[PDB]
Design a protein around this nucleic acid. Structure first.
Ligand SMILES: [Mg+2]
Ligand SMILES: [Mg+2]
Ligand SMILES: [Mg+2]
Ligand SMILES: [Mg+2]
Ligand SMILES: [Mg+2]
Ligand SMILES: [Mg+2]
Length: 72
RNA sequence: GGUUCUCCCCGAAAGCUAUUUAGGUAGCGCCUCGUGAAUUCAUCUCCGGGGGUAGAGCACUGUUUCGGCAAGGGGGUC
């Protein structure tokens, strides 16, 4: 038991993805984003619930019920 | 437009549906990793099924040529 002898348990520390650092890594160039499109752009991607322009599920279905206040 | 070290295993898609949508995006289809579950799945042989395509045919719906039998029209007589 010395400060240069302690070791973490196996599996506790995983490394972490580093994108854009060469071919050998497997995440070089595009960095896992594919080619072009909105999802490849910095800060790109659509908001939660967006399904294209199709009326989303949470707006296609009717609202129902009321909150009690006595239940609280 | 560009995205910087190495080796090992697996390995796509360019389709459908929707979209002020059409070089974008979403669910599903196809890839990967993990966990469960049954001869679960595939090939062949035998058995049980439903077809209406190829081909053919001309009863039907249409189309077509020749012959026979011929109403019945057209034209004169009146
Ligand atoms: Mg790759
Ligand atoms: Mg590019
Ligand atoms: Mg493209
Ligand atoms: Mg993309
Ligand atoms: Mg392979
Ligand atoms: Mg035929």
């Amino acid at each position: 038991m010395r400060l240069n002898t302690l070791s973490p348990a196996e599996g506790s520390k995983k490394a972490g993805k580093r994108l854009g650092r060469g071919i050998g890594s497997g995440l070089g160039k595009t960095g896992g984003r594919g080619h072009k499109g909105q999802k490849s752009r910095s800060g790109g991607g659509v908001r939660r619930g967006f399904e294209g322009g199709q009326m989303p599920l949470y707006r296609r279905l009717p609202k129902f019920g009321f909150t009690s206040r006595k239940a609280a």
